[PDB]
Amino acid sequence: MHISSQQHEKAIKSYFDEAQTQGVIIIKEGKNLSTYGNALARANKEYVPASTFDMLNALIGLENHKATTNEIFKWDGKKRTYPMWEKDMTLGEAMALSAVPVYQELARRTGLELMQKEVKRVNFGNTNIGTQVDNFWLVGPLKITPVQEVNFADDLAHNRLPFKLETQEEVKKMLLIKEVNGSKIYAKSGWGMGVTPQVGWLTGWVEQANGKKIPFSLNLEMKEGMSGSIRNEITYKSLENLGII
Ligand SMILES: Cc1onc(-c2ccccc2)c1C(=O)N[C@H](C=O)[C@@H]1N[C@@H](C(=O)O)C(C)(C)S1
């Protein structure tokens, strides 16, 4: 409104301070990138993308006819880390649930060789997937910075990735997670491996009523007993503080 930028900066740093974590949220208006939060130097450090990769995994699988958007991925009946994953689902349902096994099956369909060259073509992060086609986004060697992630989301939001328009639209329909007063929030979460603390992500964009698109990438540390929805909460408060929703 008439709120000073010092106050915006302080308000958003306090959302990270209150959660007792260290993180950054990067916003992009048109060409301009702004870095908020309580740990601004995270912006150009490299982290595994974790499930945020699901977005590119989907783009690639669909572009290369490894799946369709109505196709059902059967649960094989093995006990899963979460009961919510013990069901048959579409890619899109799997995006909302972040169903690692489905994205792993998709990655195996695509294959190491095809995955490696698609990730080069797209030049995502450090572009390196190593030798294990089914976990390189979760344990490395693939890594990416928060700046690169918000630029990725900015590409996909404006259909600039090197995939057909219809492939991009298909994956964007999968990413709708919230509606707030005429604004829509498209995004995918990520949560890295290992003992606490782990990396957390929420990367996407808001599509405003007038058609304007404002990409964001939140990146922070997931501390002992933090709920996943803290990523969402910090993100929503930040976007609201800045009047983007
Ligand atoms: C955490 C997490 O910690 N370790 C792995 C992993 C799994 C298999 C092999 C190697 C590592 C993992 C994971 O699965 N992360 C996923 C992607 O970010 C899923 N997104 C989460 C979410 O979005 O909230 C889920 C907590 C829903 S899981």
UniProtKB/TrEMBL annotation:
Question: Locate the Penicillin-binding protein transpeptidase domain: which residues?
Answer: 28-239
Q: Which Pfam families match?
A: Transpeptidase
> List-wise, which residues carry N6-carboxylysine?
54
Q: Which GO terms describe its molecular function?
A: hydrolase activity; penicillin binding
Which top-level group of life is the source organism from?
Bacteria
Coiled-coil regions listed: none
Under the heading Gene3D superfamilies, the entry gives: DD-peptidase/beta-lactamase superfamily
> Which InterPro entries does this chain map to?
Beta-lactam/transpept-like, PCN-bd_Tpept
Name of the protein: Beta-lactamase
What organism is this sequence from?
Answer: Acinetobacter baumannii
What lineage is on file?
Bacteria, Pseudomonadati, Pseudomonadota, Gammaproteobacteria, Moraxellales
